[PDB]
Amino acid sequence: NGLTVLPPLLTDEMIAQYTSALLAGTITSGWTFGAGAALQIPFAMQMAYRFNGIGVTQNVLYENQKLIANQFNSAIGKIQDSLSSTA
């Protein structure tokens, strides 16, 4: 041909390790892994901070935690179907 396509520096398995590291930090330690060393916190209390940041008082999370967890798990489930149904 005279034309050549070159590989990327990072393979898809290296990209998948970065998306894993970002996600595992976010779940276990909030924003703190961006601002310094990762500091662990329980995920219900991380979500209490996320709620308190939008001006909804944090007792609203703990008093509704099962409902909030079910709405989240259901909303994640619909993404699988929405991606599976059409290109």
Binding site: A37, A44, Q58, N59
Partner: protein, 106 residues
């Protein structure tokens, strides 16, 4: 956006064909592990921190701001109430002190 860590301020300096920013930032350090709880049961009612978090050194419960360890005695003006003990997952049993209590010695 304005350098890694929490942003305090920055200073501009000129350079040929460009600009340089000296971003001053606060980075937290020397962390310790603590036991923690989302709420506290006093007289049948759930107390939540007004700002900061509940933590324990293993024997005592304190409230502290969340970006620098500065433990305080837990009180009715460090905390706010919402509802009975039975709803909150992971609530713990501790006294919450009332600053008016010794003034009732009047």
């Amino acid at each position: 956006f304005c350098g890694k860590g929490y942003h305090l301020m920055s200073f501009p300096q000129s350079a040929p064909h460009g600009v340089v920013f000296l971003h001053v930032t606060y980075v937290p350090a020397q962390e310790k592990n603590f036991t923690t709880a989302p709420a506290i049961c006093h007289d049948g009612k759930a107390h939540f921190p007004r700002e900061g978090v509940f933590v324990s050194n293993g024997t005592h419960w304190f409230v502290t701001q969340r970006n620098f360890y500065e433990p305080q005695i837990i009180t009715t003006d460090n905390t706010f109430v919402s509802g009975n003990c039975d709803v909150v997952i992971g609530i713990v049993n501790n006294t919450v002190y009332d600053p008016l209590q010794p003034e009732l010695d009047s």
